[PDB]
């Protein structure tokens, strides 16, 4: 009574409809800031003018 286990399982089944098929999500977070950049796009440099 008023005691619950928070963990529940999806139990995915292919026979389920569109709203129950499992989906894989990858969330990318960037941080545009004044600090020096480590990761950068694939672009070609040029001589200093």
> Given the rule CB under 8 A, which residues bind another protein?
1-2, 4
Of 8 and 24, CB closest to another protein:
8
Q: Which two tokens stand for residue 16?
A: 């389920």
Q: Are the CB atoms for 10 and 19 separated by under 8 Å?
A: no
Within 13 Å of residue 35, how many CA atoms lie on the same side as its CB? 6
User: To the nearest whole angstrom, how small is the minimum distance from the Cβ of residue 16 to another protein?
Assistant: 15
User: To the nearest whole angstrom, how small is the minimum distance from the Cβ of residue 10 to another protein?
Assistant: 15
User: To the nearest whole angstrom, how small is the minimum distance from the Cβ of residue 29 to another protein?
Assistant: 30
């Amino acid at each position: 009574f008023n005691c619950y286990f928070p963990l529940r399982s999806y139990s995915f089944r292919p026979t389920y409809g569109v709203g129950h098929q499992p989906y894989r999500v990858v969330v990318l977070s960037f941080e545009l800031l004044h600090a020096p950049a480590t990761v950068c796009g694939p672009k070609k440099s040029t001589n200093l003018v």
